[PDB]
């Protein structure tokens, strides 16, 4: 009946321009467009960090080297220190 149809029609006048269409909004003085799709579109990345973890910064892992590939000055010293330990061992 009509009293539901007219409020169903009312759903096709007041909120039809709200989200069903993009005719901004008549009852509201503040606009609907420059909040969610431009200011709050970056809103999720205005809550998290930008240009570091949304870009995600796929960074090359810092490379770690061996013991400088210099065995002679330490292996014999370790061998000399191994003599010291095994006397105490």
């Amino acid at each position: 009946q009509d009293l539901y149809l007219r409020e169903l029609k009312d759903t096709k006048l007041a909120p039809s321009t709200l989200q069903d269409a993009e005719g901004n909004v008549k009852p509201w003085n503040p606009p609907q467009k420059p909040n969610l799709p431009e200011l709050e579109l970056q809103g999720p990345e205005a809550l998290k960090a930008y240009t570091e973890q949304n870009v995600e910064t796929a960074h090359v892992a810092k490379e770690s080297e061996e013991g400088e590939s210099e065995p002679i000055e330490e292996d014999w010293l370790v061998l000399d220190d191994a003599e010291e330990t095994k006397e105490s061992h």
Binding site: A61, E66, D75
Partner: protein, 57 residues
Amino acid sequence: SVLKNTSVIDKIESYVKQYKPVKIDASKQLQVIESFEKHAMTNAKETESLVSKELKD
């Protein structure tokens, strides 16, 4: 597909794929690692030759 406002996932999915070859392994130790071992062969066989001789001696 849970996000109807995707707009970044394809970029993010591509961002994963462009960095899919993240970084290779580092098997750089092929000259110093055995140098620890070359001292290991030297001293162990020096010890083993001595103890084998001394146990019978």
